[PDB]
Amino acid sequence: MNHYEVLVLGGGSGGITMAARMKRKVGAENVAIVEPSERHFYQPIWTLVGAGAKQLSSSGRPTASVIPSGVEWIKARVTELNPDKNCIHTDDDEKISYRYLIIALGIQLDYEKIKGLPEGFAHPKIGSNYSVKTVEKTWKALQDFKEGNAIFTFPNTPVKCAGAPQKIMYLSEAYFRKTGKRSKANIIFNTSLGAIFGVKKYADALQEIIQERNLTVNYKKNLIEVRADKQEAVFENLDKPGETQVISYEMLHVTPPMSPPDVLKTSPVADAAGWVDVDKETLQHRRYPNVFGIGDCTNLPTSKTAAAVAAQSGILDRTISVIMKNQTPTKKYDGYTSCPLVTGYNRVILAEFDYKAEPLETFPFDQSKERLSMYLMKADLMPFLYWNMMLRGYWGGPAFLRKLFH
Amino acid sequence: NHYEVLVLGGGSGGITMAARMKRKVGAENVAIVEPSERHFYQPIWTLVGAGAKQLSSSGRPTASVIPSGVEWIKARVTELNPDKNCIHTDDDEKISYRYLIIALGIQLDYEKIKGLPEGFAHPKIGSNYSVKTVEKTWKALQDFKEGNAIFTFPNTPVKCAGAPQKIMYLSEAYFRKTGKRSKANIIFNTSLGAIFGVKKYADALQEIIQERNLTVNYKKNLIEVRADKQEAVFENLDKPGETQVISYEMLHVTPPMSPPDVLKTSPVADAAGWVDVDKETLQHRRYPNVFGIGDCTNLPTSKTAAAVAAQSGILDRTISVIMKNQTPTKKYDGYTSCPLVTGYNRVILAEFDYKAEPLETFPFDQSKERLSMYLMKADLMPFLYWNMMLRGYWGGPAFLRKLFH
Numbered sequence: 001m002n003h004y005e006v007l008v009l010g011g012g013s014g015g016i017t018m019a020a021r022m023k024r025k026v027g028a029e030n031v032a033i034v035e036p037s038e039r040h041f042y043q044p045i046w047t048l049v050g051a052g053a054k055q056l057s058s059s060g061r062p063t064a065s066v067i068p069s070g071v072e073w074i075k076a077r078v079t080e081l082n083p084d085k086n087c088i089h090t091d092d093d094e095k096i097s098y099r100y101l102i103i104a105l106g107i108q109l110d111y112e113k114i115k116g117l118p119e120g121f122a123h124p125k126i127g128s129n130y131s132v133k134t135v136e137k138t139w140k141a142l143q144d145f146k147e148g149n150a151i152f153t154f155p156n157t158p159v160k161c162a163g164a165p166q167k168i169m170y171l172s173e174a175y176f177r178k179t180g181k182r183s184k185a186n187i188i189f190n191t192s193l194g195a196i197f198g199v200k201k202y203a204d205a206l207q208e209i210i211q212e213r214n215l216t217v218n219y220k221k222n223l224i225e226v227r228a229d230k231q232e233a234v235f236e237n238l239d240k241p242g243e244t245q246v247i248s249y250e251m252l253h254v255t256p257p258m259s260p261p262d263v264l265k266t267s268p269v270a271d272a273a274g275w276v277d278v279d280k281e282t283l284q285h286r287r288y289p290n291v292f293g294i295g296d297c298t299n300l301p302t303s304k305t306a307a308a309v310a311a312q313s314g315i316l317d318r319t320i321s322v323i324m325k326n327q328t329p330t331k332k333y334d335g336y337t338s339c340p341l342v343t344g345y346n347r348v349i350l351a352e353f354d355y356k357a358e359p360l361e362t363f364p365f366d367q368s369k370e371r372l373s374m375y376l377m378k379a380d381l382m383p384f385l386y387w388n389m390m391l392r393g394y395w396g397g398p399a400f401l402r403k404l405f406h
Numbered sequence: 407n408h409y410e411v412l413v414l415g416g417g418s419g420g421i422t423m424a425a426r427m428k429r430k431v432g433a434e435n436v437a438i439v440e441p442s443e444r445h446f447y448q449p450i451w452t453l454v455g456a457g458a459k460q461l462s463s464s465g466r467p468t469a470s471v472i473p474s475g476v477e478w479i480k481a482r483v484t485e486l487n488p489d490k491n492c493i494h495t496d497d498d499e500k501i502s503y504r505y506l507i508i509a510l511g512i513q514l515d516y517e518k519i520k521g522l523p524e525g526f527a528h529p530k531i532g533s534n535y536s537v538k539t540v541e542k543t544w545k546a547l548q549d550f551k552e553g554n555a556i557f558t559f560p561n562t563p564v565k566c567a568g569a570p571q572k573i574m575y576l577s578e579a580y581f582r583k584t585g586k587r588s589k590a591n592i593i594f595n596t597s598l599g600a601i602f603g604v605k606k607y608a609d610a611l612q613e614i615i616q617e618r619n620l621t622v623n624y625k626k627n628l629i630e631v632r633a634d635k636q637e638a639v640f641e642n643l644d645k646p647g648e649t650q651v652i653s654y655e656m657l658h659v660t661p662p663m664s665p666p667d668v669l670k671t672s673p674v675a676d677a678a679g680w681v682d683v684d685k686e687t688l689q690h691r692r693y694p695n696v697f698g699i700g701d702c703t704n705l706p707t708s709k710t711a712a713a714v715a716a717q718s719g720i721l722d723r724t725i726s727v728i729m730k731n732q733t734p735t736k737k738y739d740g741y742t743s744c745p746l747v748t749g750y751n752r753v754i755l756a757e758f759d760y761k762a763e764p765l766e767t768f769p770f771d772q773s774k775e776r777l778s779m780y781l782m783k784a785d786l787m788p789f790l791y792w793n794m795m796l797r798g799y800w801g802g803p804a805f806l807r808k809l810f811h
């Protein structure tokens with residue numbers, strides 16, 4: 001078989017990052033990345049792309065551009081993983097063996113589970129920031145919005161960036177107020193959750209925003225059908241099975257149901273639910289000692305965000321390093337994550353918490369306040385540092401800056 | 407080859423729906439896809455694990471429950487292409503259907519617990535969910551001398567969610583009926599935050615937990631079993647990263663469960679791998695000639711054989727009015743039953759619907775530990791299961807309840 005010392009599944013955020021970090025541990029020539037996509041995206045920025053504040057093109061680079069120099073890019077898809085034989089299968093009908101494996105295959109979008117999707121996106125008035133094919137469709141729907149209901153959905157599955165489905169809603173509201181349309185929009189959030197956020201500090205802040213801006217939130221409603229030709233939407237009452245609700249929309253933002261990538265759903269590396277079964281503290285796999293997981297594909301009980309990835313990568317670097325010297329790992333991931341909640345074209349509530357869903361703010365000021373400093377950080381500084389220091393391997397936890405600021 | 411009605415699975419719902427479709431389209435236009443030689447009445451496995459009933463009485467050969475004239479395709483579904491109205495089996499066949507009844511059950515995932523299924527080669531450890539492990543429960547109960555008796559509950563959907571604690575109450579009876587109670591620390595370690603999701607029988611069960619010195623540790627999910635050293639490892643779901651290693655003199659495993667693998671990636675599933683059916687008619691939300699019944703579905707009620715029975719009546723009506731080009735009208739209420747065995751002598755029969763609210767068949771109060779409910783669970787339901795339900799003649803308990811009120 002073809003064989004690499006370190007094999008990285010996925011060339012997204014965690015993939016590129018771990019590969020960059022592993023290049024400096026083992027030599028670039030002994031690292032390989034398996035990734036089908038030719039484009040690598042900083043998906044956070046799609047929130048502002050859907051709101052017309054930032055451009056799609058800037059969100060991407062060619063996968064080759066961000067592959068660390070001298071690392072092998074296997075442009076293919078993983079189709080099987082045999083951890084007991086230390087190998088994987090690709091759609092090129094190859095078998096690749098590894099000495100260590102890093103699984104960084106992200107999370108899967110499942111638009112097709114909504115009846116009438118992905119087909120309905122050929123019609124106007126409907127967008128979704130979660131896909132390169134539908135995000136500008138959000139923005140165009142927001143521009144063409146003239147009058148009616150503007151509906152934002154949140155599914156009954158795990159998601160990545162759980163704040164983004166409401167982020168776009170706040171931006172849509174502010175777009176309406178800055179264009180003389182606010183009076184003719186009835187803005188609805190139909191979420192599958194029972195609360196507006198999981199960390200009470202920011203939940204309270206967002207709630208105050210909901211009240212002070214005439215926003216309607218319907219809990220335990222889940223979108224199950226779209227009739228785009230009729231500009232209608234169908235939601236189910238999770239609290240009372242059997243009940244559906246057909247409602248007309250002038251603008252619709254879909255957050256699709258999500259799941260572990262089909263290849264993992266049946267893989268021996270998954271837990272029962274499909275995710276990479278990793279030790280919660282070291283990111284080493286619970287059953288295969290030479291396997292590691294990072295990012296959205298894992299069962300790390302925390303938010304699936306790229307900030308989480310960055311913190312994780314620092315932990316996993318140390319985990320793998322010491323495992324290689326046959327010592328027992330010591331450093332422990334704390335669950336750090338962050339949702340920079342965009343509440344307007346000029347304001348972000350920077351939410352940062354840990355495994356215990358308690359605040360863990362980096363800065364000494366109160367980040368539950370709508371701040372301009374935090375908006376500029378989300379829209380301009382983070383994308384730059386993503387390309388130029390996170391993907392080169394030099395951004396981990398913000399624990400040091402958090403201590404540095406106190 | 408082609409069939410008017412194709413049923414995927416020869417367990418409870420499959421056999422039931424196949425019996426029901428035979429009287430609709432003729433036996434010659436029905437077929438059951440199933441790989442097992444044996445069909446089990448899994449509910450009684452609870453009493454087998456307590457040594458009250460026998461593992462042989464709990465199953466029969468699959469041939470013996472197939473309705474006469476219905477084709478038994480001894481294979482396993484390997485692919486479902488509903489957009490072409492076909493499936494692929496592991497003997498490399500492709501089978502076309504006009505209508506599809508997906509009745510594939512739930513899948514046991516013992517291998518997600520490190521140390522399993524291998525550790526069942528050791529004593530002091532059993533599990534009532536598997537025909538290969540249910541008699542080990544009984545022996546672990548007999549062999550018991552001194553220490554902790556641990557009963558687990560995973561962080562997955564499960565079938566008969568009351569069963570994991572049933573075998574605990576039974577074990578507590580056994581220990582008292584053998585002079586061993588005084589030297590038995592009986593703990594239930596659950597992923598869940600509640601003993602039971604319906605307040606009326608929860609409260610009943612909690613009085614029993616208090617009156618019999620049973621401790622319940624919530625949000626503790628088993629993740630490792632060292633049968634060699636008779637240790638179990640739990641993760642604290644309330645404190646990610648936190649674990650706890652516990653020695654056992656008896657370990658009863660409820661394994662993580664999930665949709666069957668063939669469904670997990672199938673276009674008929676929702677994002678979580680369950681058959682994505684209408685919650686009232688059991689017709690598929692996106693494929694109008696596909697239907698689902700039982701554990702494999704996403705029906706938001708308890709995966710139980712009792713739920714199958716009520717579902718099978720509604721599914722029967724739903725499929726008949728569709729063949730007649732009419733829209734379905736009768737709606738499933740979410741009925742399911744859990745006959746909570748609370749000893750060798752009593753049973754708290756929980757019956758409820760979609761609203762997690764009690765929907766009892768009998769006029770008296772089923773929160774109470776009743777002898778009659780034990781003999782129903784232990785002798786009648788098995789008899790009625792083989793003799794009415796698998797033949798298509800038991801469905802909803804709607805009228806029986808209306809009768810008694």
Ligand SMILES: Cc1cc2nc3c(=O)[nH]c(=O)nc-3n(C[C@H](O)[C@H](O)[C@H](O)COP(=O)(O)OP(=O)(O)OC[C@H]3O[C@@H](n4cnc5c(N)ncnc54)[C@H](O)[C@@H]3O)c2cc1C
Nearest residue numbers: 010012013014043044078105106161295296304305306307
């Ligand atoms: C609209 C939106 C807004 C967001 N905003 C934020 C934010 O503000 N902050 C934040 O921290 N996060 C945010 N995120 C989430 C963030 O992008 C992710 O959490 C992060 O990308 C996780 O990285 P990952 O490496 O696990 O997966 P990804 O970066 O998605 O990459 C996974 C890769 O695996 C590849 N792959 C998939 N299947 C296979 C296969 N079978 N074989 C091989 N390769 C495969 C994919 O092609 C992909 O390149 C947002 C996401 C969205 C959609």
Ligand SMILES: Cc1cc2nc3c(=O)[nH]c(=O)nc-3n(C[C@H](O)[C@H](O)[C@H](O)COP(=O)(O)OP(=O)(O)OC[C@H]3O[C@@H](n4cnc5c(N)ncnc54)[C@H](O)[C@@H]3O)c2cc1C
Nearest residue numbers: 415417418419448449482483510511566700701710711712
């Ligand atoms: C210990 C225990 C106690 C229980 N007690 C009770 C109780 O007291 N009351 C109650 O109401 N319920 C009880 N149940 C629940 C009951 O067993 C199930 O809910 C019921 O059997 C569900 O039926 P089903 O048709 O959905 O699947 P099953 O009856 O489990 O059968 C599914 C079938 O699908 C087949 N299959 C799987 N994959 C494939 C494939 N790829 N291709 C083809 N065929 C396949 C399997 O071989 C199996 O025959 C209990 C269950 C257990 C395990």
